[PDB]
Amino acid sequence: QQDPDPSQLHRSSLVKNLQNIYFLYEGDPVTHENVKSVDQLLSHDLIYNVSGPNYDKLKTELKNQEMATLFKDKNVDIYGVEYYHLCYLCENAERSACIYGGVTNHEGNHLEIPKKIVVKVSIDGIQSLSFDIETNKKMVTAQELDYKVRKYTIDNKQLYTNGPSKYETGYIKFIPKNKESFWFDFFPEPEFTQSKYLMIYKDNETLDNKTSQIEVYLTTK
Amino acid sequence: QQDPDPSQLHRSSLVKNLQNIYFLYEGDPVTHENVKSVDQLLSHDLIYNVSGPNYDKLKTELKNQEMATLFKDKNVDIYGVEYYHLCYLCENAERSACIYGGVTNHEGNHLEIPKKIVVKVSIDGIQSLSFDIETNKKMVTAQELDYKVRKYTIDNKQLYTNGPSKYETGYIKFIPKNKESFWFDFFPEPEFTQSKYLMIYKDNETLDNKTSQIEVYLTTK
Amino acid sequence: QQDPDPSQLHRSSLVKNLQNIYFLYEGDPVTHENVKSVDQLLSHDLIYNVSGPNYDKLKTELKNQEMATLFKDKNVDIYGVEYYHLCYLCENAERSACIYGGVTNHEGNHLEIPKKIVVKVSIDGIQSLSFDIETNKKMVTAQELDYKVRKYTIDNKQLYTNGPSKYETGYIKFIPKNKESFWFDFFPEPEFTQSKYLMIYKDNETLDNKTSQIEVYLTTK
Amino acid sequence: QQDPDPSQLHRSSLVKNLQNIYFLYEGDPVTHENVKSVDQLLSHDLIYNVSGPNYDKLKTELKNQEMATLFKDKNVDIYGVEYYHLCYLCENAERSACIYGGVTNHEGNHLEIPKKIVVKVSIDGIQSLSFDIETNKKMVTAQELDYKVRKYTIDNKQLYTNGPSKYETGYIKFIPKNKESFWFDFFPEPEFTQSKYLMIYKDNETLDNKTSQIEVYLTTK
Q: For residues B181 and B174, what is the distance between their CA atoms, to the nearest angstrom?
């Protein structure tokens, strides 16, 4: 996946119920340390018995059978963006919370002191500023990072709000030490659902933090 | 509807996922003043464009057509218990909240100072206590009252909890000045959904507060 | 319940997607002889392991907890109207078919030769005609009957069509030997779903057939 | 996409409710010619106003936004496999039917005399047989082809049944004149739904028939 073309980005002025992206990155993500799965719905997911402000049962669809059937009996660390509309867990379950990926092993992958990662932000060409985000992992999911990133740029520069977004075309770029960089679009198609936009966090993409760099390119229209 | 017979009561011990009753009465009720309806799904429900911590659209299924098309264009006051699991609003809507009844006209029915209604609580036959609850309406909905009554006894004497109840069989009774008393069971059938147990709040039963009394009958087991 | 008032009747010209009532009575109802339930979802329904053109699992919402847990272990006969849209049976089942009531004991209640029951149909006051329907039960469900009744009047005098109805206001009336006659409006509220209009078959109402009569009141407008 | 490794194939013996695959290819596909779209739920789908034995509304999710907003106003031919369970179209419509892909232009692309396509089938290494399938299109969808190809083998050699299959691992392969051949696994992961398995028909893949070949590889066990 190579650098995006200016016509391939979705534009924030065509999205209708745009806000539905706000709450996602404004609210509190899901965080669980050293926990083990206990049952699964389909071959490619895993269910956990954990709680939060609006749930006591969680689900995370993974990339495929081979992956799910890998973390099935291991201890892992969860960190993910959740949705409540359109989420199934079990016939007998009200109060559910779905998510995509966000799964990392627990032992060894934890660090003593927080690694400092730097984000560079460009707007209309000009590189305008810099800020930091942390993490207690040697191998974090692009999900944990992308989130933390936006959170900041939403409560300060204002990436999303309960209404029209200030910018128009935005996307985050990951730059791994070994190879091939990738990106995510900051805005969805005209009409959409949450459950669908978040599928990007399906591949449970993980990467070393000690050697990865991030870039953000926004457009003021 | 005459006084219930001791076998006709649902027994707390039998219910399985009982907690789900707890949240309904330990959380914050939906409250809106002087608001009007803006669209309706089926012939007997009205939909409001209001907001809260977990929504931005609301639905209240009333008793029947004739009723709904009566409050279809009036300004009213909403006071009610909501459920998120299995709630339908519009094809394009995430973040909804549904309820039953809880509708009263807005003009006049309001009061300067809060009427004081007294509740007599029995337990294993002996009337051990009494407490108070308020209201700013001349014609309140037995729902507004039912709620307020439980929230208390739950936070203090412990009616419901994040698990098994302390008591076994409980119900509330209303005594209207004009005639015919009625009651609600405090526990649902063994296996149930939220949206089904609440239907007792479908008849949008209203009544004068200046002359109505309340009684609670619990059995310790 | 006494003879209805000409203003409480739903008027077929107001229903928007009326057709949907057509397929319910113009389709092959469900019919299964001597069978036993095998699992249950909620405390007031029963599930059966039977087959048909569009299903291989069935459910039947009954009146209350007390009624369901009565046919839980008995051999019974099911004759009823089904709906596919909006129907849950188990987390793992596609191809489902739901219904309301239509449950009767099997042993004894069966007859050697079919009883002949006559129906009398009015039309704008005048008693226009008569026709027949059969049954192999001593105690049938008004559902079994109400169905048989309409299916005829729809294929011949066209009660419902893939479209607007020829008549405007009709309802069937039951006259049981002992006491209280009861009726069903032939048309639903303006806007509706199927699972809700069918709820009148929930009281699994049954009666002797050796002494029961029927009447039909329609209005050409 | 190169030839599959005998370990990446799903084994029917591990599948639980496999029958559901059966009905999909043993049932009547959806067929409509020279039609136009009429509204769209999301940004990557299209809705048509057509009718069949179990529906009067149909949907077909496409690859992405740029494809849908391309067949939005053209005259197209739909050929596809449909799923009922879990299918959303509009808040007011029961009787739906969903699909993925299966869309082709209508003018010109039609042939006077049906093109004969030969399929070669292998079984445990040995090329045991060959047969025929027809099509009235210059540019056909791999879906229309894959379907026809199975139905046969199913009603004859018995690919799927209302139960365990006879075979263990199967997959069809397409060999276009220009380049890159591809394949589909005849079987789903152990636990799945219909709507997910069928997503292979999303990329609405299309190829010329005057120059395409097919091959099937099965493994008795």
A: 6
Residues whose CB falls within 8 Å of the CB of residue A214, separated by 6 or more in sequence, listed in order: A117, A118, A119, A120, A145, A149, A172, A173, A174, A175
Distance between C94 CA and the closest CA of chain D, angstroms: 6
Neighbours of A66 (CB within 10 A): 12
Residues of A in contact with D43 (CB under 8 A): 189-192
Cα of B41 to nearest chain D Cα, Å: 9
- Cβ of A88 and C88 within 8 Å? no
Element (H, E) at D47: strand D45-48
What approach was used to elucidate this structure?
A: X-ray
Give the CATH number, domain containing residue D139.
3.10.20.120
Nearest-by-Cβ selection for B43 from C40, C42, C189: C189
CB-count burial class (<10 Å; 0-12, 13-18, 19+) for D89: buried
* Phi, then psi, of B86 in degrees rounded to 5: 75, 65
Q: A95 and chain B: CB distance < 8 Å anywhere?
A: yes
How far apart are the C-alpha atoms of B30 and B80, rounded to whole Å? 5
Nearest CB neighbour to D65, from listed A41, A189, A196: A189
- Per the CB < 8 A criterion, the answer to whether D54 and D126 are in contact is no
Last-in-domain residue among B87, B106, B125: B106
D51 touches chain C (CB under 8 A): no
Residue in chain B closest to C188 (alpha carbons) equals B43
Q: Which residues contact B143 (CB under 8 A, 6 or more apart)?
A: B79, B80, B81, B100, B101, B102, B201, B205
Q: Which residues of C touch A88 (CB under 8 A)?
A: 91
Q: Is C69 strand, coil or helix?
A: helix
Q: With an 8 Å Cβ cutoff, is C92 touching chain D?
A: yes
Q: Are residues B116 and B150 in the same domain?
A: yes
Closest approach of chain A CAs to the CA of C90, in angstroms? Answer: 6
The verdict on C60 and C50 lying in the same domain is yes
Instruction: Measure in Å the smallest separation between the Cα of A94 and chain B Cα atoms.
Output: 6
Where among A106, A138, A169 does a domain terminate? A106
In chain C, which residues have their Cβ closer than 8 Å to the Cβ of B193?
Answer: 42
Q: Which one of B15, B67, B88, B189 makes the best mutation probe of the C interface by having the most chain C beta carbons within 10 Å?
A: B189
Same domain, C154 and C188: yes
| Long-range contacts (CB closer than 8 Å, 24 or more residues apart) made by C108-112 | C108/C138, C109/C77, C109/C137, C109/C138, C109/C139, C110/C136, C110/C137, C110/C138, C111/C136, C111/C137, C111/C138
- B–D interface: beta-carbon pairs under 8 A: 7
A192 in D contact zone (CB under 8 Å): yes
Cα separation, C111 vs C131, in Å, equals 21
Q: How far apart are the first and last CA of chain A?
A: 26
Does residue A203 share a domain with residue A142?
Answer: yes
**CA dihedral (B68, B73, B77, B80) positive or negative:** positive
Query: Cβ contact (<8 Å) for D95 and C85?
Result: yes
Resolution in Å equals 3.6
Task: Give the number of beta-carbon pairs within 8 Å between C and D.
Answer: 32
**CB distance C164 to C13 below 8 Å:** yes
**D8 and D81 inside one domain:** no
Asked if C18 and C32 sit in the same domain, the reply is no
Residue D123 DSSP SS3: strand
Q: How far apart are alpha carbons A185 and D64 in whole angstroms?
A: 14
Give the list of residues 6+ apart from residue B134 with CB closer than 8 angstroms, or none: B114, B115, B116, B117, B148
Using CB atoms within 10 A of its CB, is residue A121 exposed (0-12), middle (13-18) or buried (19+)? buried
Distance of CA A23 to the CA centre of its chain: 13
B44: chain C residues, CB-CB within 8 Å = 189
Owning domain of residue B9: 1-26+109-220
| CB-CB neighbours of C216 under 10 Å | 23
* C134 & C40 share domain: no
